[PDB]
Ligand binder design. Structure first.
Ligand SMILES: *[C@H](CCCCCCCCCCCCCC)C(=O)NCCNC(=O)CCNC(=O)[C@H](O)C(C)(C)COP(*)(=O)O
Lengths: 62, 63
């Protein structure tokens, strides 16, 4: 009967704890994916993981 | 022109002997300054004025 839940109960960064649990090599990939996602969100366009943010227009405010 | 000013005996406050212009190029951002470009324009001004940096004792920076 509970079906599902989606409430904003994230609070503390479970991302940080899950990365800490994961081996340090994995930390690079997870951080890479998080940064790519957030930068694509803020710059409104998808990005490459190696192209400079400068060539993506990341200004001072960005 | 300083020779003409001396020739006509006009009031002279000070003489400028060299001016230089330089651009930072592609810095980190659109407003980021370049230390290397500033040093380059300083060298260009010194060369154009025909004078040594040790001679100058007062510097009026952008600040
Ligand atoms: C000159 C400052 C003059 C600014 C005047 C703003 C006028 C508004 C628009 C005029 C419209 C004209 C009408 C035409 C139709 C100056 O001496 N610059 C100050 C020194 N310049 C710099 O060093 C840049 C200053 N640095 C910053 O504050 C940062 O770069 C910023 C704010 C961009 C943020 O960080 P980001 O660089 O990481």
């Amino acid at each position: 009967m509970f079906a599902s839940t989606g409430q904003r109960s994230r609070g503390p960064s479970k991302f940080r704890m899950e990365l800490l649990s994961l081996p340090q090599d994995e930390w690079a990939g997870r951080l890479r994916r998080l940064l790519v996602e957030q930068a694509s969100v803020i710059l409104r366009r998808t990005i490459d993981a190696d192209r400079s943010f400068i060539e993506y227009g990341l200004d001072s405010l960005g | 022109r300083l020779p003409d000013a001396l020739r006509d005996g006009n009031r002279i406050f000070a003489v400028v002997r060299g001016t230089a212009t330089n651009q930072d190029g592609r810095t980190e951002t659109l407003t980021m300054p370049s230390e290397d470009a500033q040093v380059a324009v300083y060298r260009a001004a010194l060369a154009a004025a025909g004078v040594q940096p040790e001679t100058v004792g007062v510097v009026e920076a952008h600040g």
